């Protein structure tokens, strides 16, 4: 009864708009959670003028009002598709889990990183009798200190609503038996990182805070090649690097060009873990706008792109100019693939847009030839179009 009264206490000493948000959540958590997941990938006015936006904000600002003082263990069910397991572990009626499917789920979640987002309802105990057990996969996570967790009551039980803004690393999975059915229990960890999903104000603030003292320690030749890379020559450098230079056409002055722009990135590494974004076109995945595969409203297209790229390692021979804002721009509003790179600490690269005078806004650059492992491929709908988000990570 203590936790009951504490949850009913927290749910009275808060704003009335927050009460309205949470009460709307008590019935329509589906589309609210979908919005908290896919909200960051629209336009500025699209985000602000959206009706479901503000109450999200409200409920969001409720979550952050109740932080915990010590790490807390939580448990929640999860579908295996959330971890790029595109098949069934066991039918919801079956009771046993095959050794083969277990080993497959093991080898497909061995050492990946899965970024999370949106609202999530969790509990503080293992599910038992009467509890809802929808999926054969149970995640046991440890939330760190200062993590907003709002307890609430759906008129019969108590739940803990949190917002997840981290990436999960599954360590070990085990077979469990609950009430005569076999489940998979996975141990997860939190791998925090820096993120500025839509509020790019904080983003470029931190950027020009950290890299204002960056360019003032460069040689005039490298600053020259950096600024003529910025001002149009980047196209030529990209189609020179992807033209197989160092093996087919050794170009001395362009080799000097590329080595000076590459050394102009390994001087002040990225100081923390960043969540960087980049819209891109079909020409990088062996596709074109006139191909039928680009029509991602086809279930078979999403499935084939998953089978062809999910869990693979892409290698980009040219430089990857990227942005730290999930918001859609008009310069590349026609692109439909969104690569979401995770950059670790002490990584080569730099936020070149610290010095004004560039077309690309909030743009970061990292060394060419660094591979990206794709951990997850999911999709969302911008208006009528179906665009794909590609949770990937820098694998050095």
Partner 1 sequence: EDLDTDNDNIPDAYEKNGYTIKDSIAVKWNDSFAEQGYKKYVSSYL
Residues that bind partner 1 (CB under 8 A): 69-71, 91, 93-96, 126, 142, 145, 172, 174-182, 185
Compare residues 164 and 301 and give the one whose CB is closer to partner 1: 164
State in angstroms the smallest separation of the CB of 7 from partner 1.
22
| Cα 336–chain centre separation | 16
Query: Which 8-state DSSP code applies to residue 332?
Result: T
By CB atoms closer than 10 A (0-12, 13-18, 19+), residue 185 is middle
CA angle, residues 172, 175, 177, in degrees to nearest 5: 140
Residues within the annotated binding site?
A: 278-279, 281, 283-284, 318, 321, 335, 361, 363
Q: What is the C-alpha separation between 58 and 55, in angstroms, rounded?
A: 5
DSSP for 273-287? -EEEEEEE-GGGTT-
Residues within the annotated binding site for NADH?
A: 278-279, 283-284, 318, 321, 335, 363
Residue 338's closest CA among 328, 348, 352, 351?
328
Residues within the annotated binding site for NADPH?
A: 278-279, 283, 318, 335, 361, 363
CA distances from 325 to 54, 143, 198, 199, 379 (A): 20, 26, 6, 7, 18
SS3 at position 149:
strand
State in angstroms the smallest separation of the CB of 72 from partner 1.
8
Compare residues 171 and 303 and give the one whose CB is closer to partner 1: 171
State in angstroms the smallest separation of the CB of 99 from partner 1.
8
Residues within the annotated binding site for NAD(+)?
A: 278-279, 281, 283-284, 318, 335, 361, 363
State in angstroms the smallest separation of the CB of 289 from partner 1.
43
Compare residues 112 and 279 and give the one whose CB is closer to partner 1: 112
State in angstroms the smallest separation of the CB of 33 from partner 1.
27
Compare residues 8 and 179 and give the one whose CB is closer to partner 1: 179
Residue 82's closest CA among 193, 186, 195, 196?
186
Q: What is the C-alpha separation between 206 and 271, in angstroms, rounded?
A: 11
- For residue 66 the two structure tokens come to 């109740």
Compare residues 130 and 357 and give the one whose CB is closer to partner 1: 130
State in angstroms the smallest separation of the CB of 4 from partner 1.
25
Compare residues 65 and 169 and give the one whose CB is closer to partner 1: 169
């Amino acid at each position: 009864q203590w936790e009951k009264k504490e949850a009913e206490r927290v749910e009275k000493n808060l704003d009335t708009l927050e009460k309205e948000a949470l009460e709307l959540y008590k019935k329509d958590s589906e589309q609210i959670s979908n919005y908290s997941q896919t909200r960051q990938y629209f336009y500025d006015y699209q985000i602000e003028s959206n009706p479901r936006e503000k109450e999200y904000k409200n409920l969001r600002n409720a979550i952050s009002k109740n932080k915990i003082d010590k790490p807390i263990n939580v448990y929640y069910f999860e579908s295996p598709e959330k971890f790029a397991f595109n098949k069934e572990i066991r039918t919801e009626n079956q009771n046993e889990i095959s050794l083969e499917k277990f080993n497959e789920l093991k080898e497909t979640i061995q050492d990946k990183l899965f970024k999370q987002d949106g609202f999530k309802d969790v509990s503080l105990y293992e599910p038992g009798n009467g509890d809802e057990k929808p999926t054969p996969l149970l995640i046991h996570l440890k939330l760190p200190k200062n993590t907003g967790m709002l307890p609430y009551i759906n008129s019969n039980d108590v739940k803990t609503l949190i917002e997840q803004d981290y990436s999960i690393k599954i360590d070990k999975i085990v077979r469990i038996v609950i009430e005569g059915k076999q489940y998979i229990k996975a141990e997860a960890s939190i791998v925090n990182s820096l993120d500025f999903k839509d509020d790019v104000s904080k983003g470029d603030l931190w950027g020009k805070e950290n890299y204002s003292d960056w360019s003032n320690k460069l040689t005039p030749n490298e600053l020259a090649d950096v600024n003529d890379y910025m001002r149009g020559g980047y196209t030529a450098i990209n189609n020179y690097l992807i033209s197989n230079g160092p093996l087919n056409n050794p170009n001395p002055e362009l080799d000097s060009k590329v080595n000076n722009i590459e050394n102009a990135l390994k001087l002040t590494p990225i100081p923390s873990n960043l969540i960087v974004y980049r819209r891109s076109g079909p020409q990088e995945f062996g596709l074109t706008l006139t191909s039928p595969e680009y029509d991602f409203n086809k279930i078979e297209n999403i499935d084939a792109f998953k089978e062809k790229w999910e869990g693979k390692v892409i290698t980009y021979p040219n430089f990857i100019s990227t942005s730290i804002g999930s918001v859609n721009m008009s310069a590349f509003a026609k692109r439909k693939i969104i690569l979401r790179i995770n950059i670790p600490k002490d990584s080569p690269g730099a936020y070149l847009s610290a010095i004004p005078g560039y077309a690309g806004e909030y743009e970061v650059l990292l060394n060419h030839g660094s591979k990206f492992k794709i951990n997850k491929v999911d999709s969302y709908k911008d208006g009528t179009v179906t665009k794909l988000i590609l949770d990937a990570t820098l694998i050095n």
